């Protein structure tokens, strides 16, 4: 059985392809 414990905010640059898949940059899609 799995349990949630903690988390971190992964490092992702502002110009990289947004993980949202929107094609746009990170500082454009969802990481303003």
């Amino acid at each position: 059985q799995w349990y949630y414990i903690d988390g971190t905010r992964p490092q992702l640059g502002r110009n990289d392809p947004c993980p949202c898949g929107s094609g746009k940059k990170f500082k454009k899609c969802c990481g303003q």
Binding site: Q1, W2, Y3, Y4, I5, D6, G7, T8, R9, P10, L12, P19, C20, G21, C30, G31
Partner: protein
């Protein structure tokens, strides 16, 4: 302990979607990770959580 913290957090956020973009786990570690974007709105403003949560295995 948290229980009322948890209920109280319900009134404040409206969730709008979950996108998982990375996932790893391993039996030998009893650990895994899930990276995700969780979109929401609070008091009428859109925002997005980007986070890599860590999970661990106990029993089974």
């Amino acid at each position: 302990a948290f229980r009322d913290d948890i209920i109280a957090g319900f009134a404040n956020t409206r969730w709008l979607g979950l996108t998982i973009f990375e996932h790893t786990w391993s039996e030998a570690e009893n650990t895994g990770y899930v990276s995700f974007i969780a979109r929401f709105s609070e008091q009428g403003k859109n925002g997005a959580i980007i986070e890599r949560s860590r999970f661990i295995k106990e029993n089974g």
